[PDB]
Design a protein around this ligand. Structure first.
Ligand SMILES: NC(=O)c1ccc[n+]([C@@H]2O[C@H](COP(=O)([O-])OP(=O)(O)OC[C@H]3O[C@@H](n4cnc5c(N)ncnc54)[C@H](OP(=O)(O)O)[C@@H]3O)[C@@H](O)[C@H]2O)c1
Ligand SMILES: COc1ccc2c(C(=S)N(C)CC(=O)O)cccc2c1C(F)(F)F
Ligand SMILES: COc1ccc2c(C(=S)N(C)CC(=O)O)cccc2c1C(F)(F)F
Ligand SMILES: COc1ccc2c(C(=S)N(C)CC(=O)O)cccc2c1C(F)(F)F
Ligand SMILES: COc1ccc2c(C(=S)N(C)CC(=O)O)cccc2c1C(F)(F)F
Length: 316
């Protein structure tokens, strides 16, 4: 398996990266350092994860140690919902860059299509339990993202949690300068996303799969929720290969020509999770895992369902 995939901006993106949502500041510097040591080159970051400073320390240390050079790293971050106004986008990106201690990002994504009220809080809600939106739209934010490419701050721009009609709005934008390079979406055996994946691949847009292990540390996990890592049918495939269930779950999107970003702050798991280039899931494994789709999301974000740009009402 080739370890990078070609983007529509000409750059090559590593198909297996390290996720950092919920990685505590106190553990993420070691996590990123060990990830780089064992071969990860792609780190998936976000301002809202509130640990970009500590990710930055790790990257800077590995550059100083001469373990990697900046050109070999693929660093991704995301524009948070409260910064969709055009006049706020450059500062949001530069805050990330300054916290990461980088002078460019390889990829910058609109984190969610939904703009939130600008201000200090990240998840502004009202007394009904619903998010407080901003008067921003997808096209104007996308234009602001384009400016970041032209000023040299990011090498590629993309989107996350966009449904196919929202992607099409950008592809159809009057005077579009850069197509999205990537759509990062939830994807795993219980949410296999065939239709949205087909749409994006048909357009030349690479898909990144998030929460590939089913995000068992997500704050809202409930005991009755299905659990990928404990699913006996996936254990049985793992057993056949003398691999772990996580390893099966990571290799699965790889063989669908997706990028995947499993998260861990545990050095042993970080190393295990990267050890997926030495086996192949069979055609039976692959189709059996696809057959487990339930269209079930760990990231539904029910607090956002009234937002005009909530992405998961459409079929895909
Ligand atoms: N764009 C967005 O809207 C969005 C949304 C969600 C996630 N993401 C990205 O996708 C990344 C991955 O998703 P996620 O963080 O939700 O969850 P995930 O990667 O599906 O699962 C992470 C969890 O699995 C555990 N784990 C990791 N490797 C393991 C292994 N080999 N064996 C057993 N347990 C293991 C981790 O524990 P420890 O860390 O304690 O080891 C943590 O509890 C995120 O961190 C983020 O970068 C993006
Ligand atoms: C800004 O929002 C944060 C920030 C940090 C987290 C964490 C982090 S990294 N911690 C609570 C720190 C720690 O585990 O020590 C874990 C789960 C959700 C988070 C969230 C979330 F909003 F998802 F709840
Ligand atoms: C779970 O909710 C958390 C958890 C942690 C944070 C942090 C973090 S990661 N900490 C204060 C640092 C730490 O816990 O070590 C920063 C800002 C908002 C958070 C939030 C918040 F929801 F407020 F956004
Ligand atoms: C779009 O709405 C979102 C999106 C993400 C969050 C998160 C985050 S940071 N995640 C689910 C992780 C991510 O989006 O990468 C945490 C708490 C509330 C959220 C909300 C919301 F506030 F509305 F519930
Ligand atoms: C653990 O901390 C949580 C947990 C859940 C939320 C939510 C909710 S209820 N969800 C993300 C669940 C959902 O909307 O589906 C919205 C905003 C902030 C949250 C936070 C936060 F800390 F960010 F305030």
């Amino acid at each position: 398996m080739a370890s990078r995939i070609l983007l529509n901006n000409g750059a090559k993106m590593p198909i297996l990266g390290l996720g950092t949502w919920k990685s505590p500041p106190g553990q993420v510097t070691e996590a990123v350092k060990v990830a780089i040591d064992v071969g990860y080159r792609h780190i998936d970051c976000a301002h809202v994860y509130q640990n970009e400073n500590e990710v930055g320390v790790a990257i800077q240390e590995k550059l100083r140690e001469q373990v990697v050079k900046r050109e070999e790293l693929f660093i991704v971050s995301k524009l948070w919902c409260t910064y969709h106004e055009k006049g706020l986008v450059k500062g949001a990106c530069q805050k990330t860059l300054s916290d990461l201690k980088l002078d460019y990002l390889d990829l910058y994504l609109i984190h969610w299509p939904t703009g939130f009220k600008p201000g200090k809080e990240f998840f502004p809600l009202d007394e009904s339990g619903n998010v407080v939106p901003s008067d921003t739209n997808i096209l104007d934010t996308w234009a602001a993202m384009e400016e970041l490419v032209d000023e040299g701050l990011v090498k590629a721009i993309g989107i996350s949690n966009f449904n196919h009609l929202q992607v099409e709005m950008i592809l159809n934008k009057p005077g579009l300068k850069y197509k999205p390079a990537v759509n990062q979406i939830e994807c795993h055996p219980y949410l296999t996303q065939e239709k949205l994946i087909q749409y994006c691949q048909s357009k030349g847009i690479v898909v990144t799969a998030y929460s590939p292990l089913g995000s068992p540390d997500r704050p809202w996990a409930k005991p009755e929720d299905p659990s990928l890592l404990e699913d006996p049918r996936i254990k049985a495939i793992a057993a056949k290969h003398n691999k772990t269930t996580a390893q099966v779950l990571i290799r699965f999107p790889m063989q669908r020509n997706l990028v995947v970003i499993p998260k861990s702050v545990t050095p042993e798991r970080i190393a295990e999770n990267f050890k997926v280039f030495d086996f192949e899931l069979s055609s039976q494994d692959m189709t059996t895992l696809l057959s487990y789709n339930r269209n079930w999301r760990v990231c539904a974000l029910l607090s956002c369902t009234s937002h005009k740009d909530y992405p998961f009402h459409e079929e895909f």
